[PDB]
Amino acid sequence: MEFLKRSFAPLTEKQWQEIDNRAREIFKTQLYGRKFVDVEGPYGWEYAAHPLGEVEVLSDENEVVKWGLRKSLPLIELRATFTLDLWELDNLERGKPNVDLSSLEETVRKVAEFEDEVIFRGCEKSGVKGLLSFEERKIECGSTPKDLLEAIVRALSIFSKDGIEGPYTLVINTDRWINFLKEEAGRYPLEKRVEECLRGGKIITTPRIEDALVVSERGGDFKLILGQDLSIGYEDREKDAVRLFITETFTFQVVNPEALILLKF
Amino acid sequence: MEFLKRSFAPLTEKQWQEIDNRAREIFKTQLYGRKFVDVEGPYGWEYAAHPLGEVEVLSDENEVVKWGLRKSLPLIELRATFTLDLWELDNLERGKPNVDLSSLEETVRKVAEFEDEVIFRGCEKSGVKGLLSFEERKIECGSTPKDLLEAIVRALSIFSKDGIEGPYTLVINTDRWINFLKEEAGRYPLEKRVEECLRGGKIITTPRIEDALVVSERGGDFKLILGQDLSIGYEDREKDAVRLFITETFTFQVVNPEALILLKF
Amino acid sequence: MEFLKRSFAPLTEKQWQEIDNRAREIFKTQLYGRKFVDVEGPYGWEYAAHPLGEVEVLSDENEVVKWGLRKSLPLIELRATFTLDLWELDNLERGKPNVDLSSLEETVRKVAEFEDEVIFRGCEKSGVKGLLSFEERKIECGSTPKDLLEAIVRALSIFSKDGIEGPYTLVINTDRWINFLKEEAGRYPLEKRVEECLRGGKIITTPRIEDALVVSERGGDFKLILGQDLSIGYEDREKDAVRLFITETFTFQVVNPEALILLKF
Ligand SMILES: Cc1cc2nc3c(=O)[nH]c(=O)nc-3n(C[C@H](O)[C@H](O)[C@H](O)CO)c2cc1C
Ligand SMILES: Cc1cc2nc3c(=O)[nH]c(=O)nc-3n(C[C@H](O)[C@H](O)[C@H](O)CO)c2cc1C
Ligand SMILES: Cc1cc2nc3c(=O)[nH]c(=O)nc-3n(C[C@H](O)[C@H](O)[C@H](O)CO)c2cc1C
Predict the structure, then answer these.
(1) Same structural domain for residues B121 and B150?
(2) Cα separation, B51 vs C125, whole angstroms
(3) Are residues A7 and A72 in the same domain?
(4) Beta bridge partners of C57
(5) Which of B10, B129, B228, B264 has its CA 20 to 30 A from that of B153?
(6) Of A17, A93, A96, which to mutate for an interface test with C (greatest number of C Cβ within 10 Å)?
(7) How many CB atoms lie within 10 A of CB A253?
(8) Which domain range does residue A236 map to?
(9) How would you list the strands of the sheet with C76-85, edge to edge?
């Protein structure tokens, strides 16, 4: 970790620990994609491309020696910067419990949006295809609370006709869930009725999408490949403040498209 | 504990024990604030002030030597007195099971109101700010039983956007709770429906406030600092009665304002 | 001592030692107050206030619960800065014995005046009262060498009438002492004659005051309270020079006013 020049910054260990503890808390709750996909362990700060497993033929027809080239996926690297104030940071040694750290939090939120955008909608220049692009896995639904229960029962049959098993999960918007909750009138609780038709599943509410989808959790269908995880480092100094940055390197892919169903309201 | 001149009073050990056992029972139920805040252990009868961690600059612009003063919070001390009757107290040795002790109980109640007043509404002359003064954490609500369930679901999203976690608690008035209970008609029980949306929380009913609020219980956001806990002592004697008093020393503060939400009906 | 960022400055250990050795010498001779008062050991960089031991009552007359606030003294913190030159400092490694360090010495003198000012004349905004403010302990004197000897004998009787004992000390100006020395003509030496009437005492000559005073040295009447002692640290760098500072935190008080007498010429 020597490429992050952390020992040339005028701070103490307590101040570094205070800065490190606050970002982990927000990253733990605002990264929504990492709750139902797989992660492949880090490879290092020198990894560059990931193989696909094919050949493209570039020679002509009547030649004696024939040749081609192999194919892969490139990785993405990012960086974002911010500033902090030294006299304000210096009261932690006199014994203040609460210190102002708002710019750090704002930058963390804007970084956390960037990865979910790629996981859900893909990147054109890199050659990545997202979860909402497979438009041969669609099912119509309605707005009454019983249409949802009918649609879940219909979807499990399509899952079983292909040989797919395992625990199942539902991912849905938030305003639609609130409307469903308000529609019912003092009946049996709706969350238990929903979890009975998934044979003991879960529910996840998010602001990233606009409709609902259903997935299976046996393992090995969506992969996120990491080279280096999220890290903080030091840049320079300007007369009363310091400048720091955040960085990461990754890519993503989908293997079996048969473990996914989309609902259209 | 020698500053309470308890060995110069004309009483026996049984009589002291009878007096001590009755006040603990009422203090255990009538102190409502101590159910969801933290307590920092006692420091002694000589503690005077608590540091804040800043400096205020009082010198001029072009001087060579510059100076200022440090800042802190002072503690509060209280005292309250009452009288008791000797011939009536003397039947405990002949073997009476029930003795009249009404003035003690009345004084205990009036002392217990005083601390909750400060915790919920602050003290101007000492420099304390209470829980109901942070008016940038407000949410509108309604009067039907489903508006409450909608508002809880809305509040948990605001909690998650800041990185705050942990078990959650609801604090509400008593007449409003009774009205909510009477509105429903033989449906599924309402207490279980409420505790399902808090993901397994609790409910606290009190007469000290007028509306509702929601808090988180991970630990370390509201602090009560004690020098000496509640104690009883002896003053003098007037020809058929004795005079006694109750005393304490404390202060209070709020650290993280992001773990609190107020509801407006 | 990590709050003084001393390991981020471009200097070597020999240069730090040369800088540290020169300030101690001047502080040892120019701090006049520390020769006859007591010192209470350091408490740390987080100490903020010192207790007095009283209560101020703020409630009304007919209330049932009465209350007040405790009282203390705040501490004073100071800081002063200066600059030094790198090429000039670099000849110490080639082997030069004498290096130019004049600004350091000038700043040290101006800092040393500041504390004696407070010890002898007090600070209004902080609530400190100095040694020259107790104007009920006065005695008239004259200008001949025998008036001084009469006044000392008169003062020891006032000391004995109150029960005060111990070795005694005289603190006097410098021009007046020179005039007294010039007045006499070849008699027995004057210093021995003065030290015989103090029963074996001492004499201290200073430029801080304008007349004389007499004190007793048994112990425990004037106190100087320290949080952090005098220290040197590093700030920044500007293209051929470096910037450093000096800091301290303290307060002062007088306990027994009966061990002090002032002489008026
Ligand atoms: C009493 C006092 C304390 C100060 N403490 C700090 C400090 O802890 N950290 C800081 O960066 N600046 C501090 N400063 C400001 C700093 O001294 C100033 O910006 C530069 O030294 C100006 O050359 C302080 C200033 C004063 C007057
Ligand atoms: C039979 C009798 C028993 C008494 N017992 C008590 C007693 O136990 N405690 C008490 O304070 N006064 C008691 N008194 C009242 C007490 O004697 C009276 O107030 C004073 O002694 C009058 O000088 C008693 C009086 C009588 C007549
Ligand atoms: C022969 C020579 C020796 C020097 N030695 C030093 C030195 O020991 N320390 C220093 O700060 N500058 C020194 N300087 C000046 C320094 O080289 C110059 O200010 C910067 O390098 C200009 O870019 C020296 C310059 C010369 C010509």
Answers:
(1) no
(2) 20
(3) yes
(4) C68
(5) B129
(6) A93
(7) 14
(8) 1-131+217-254
(9) B49-57, B66-74, C76-85, C241-254, C222-237, C38-40
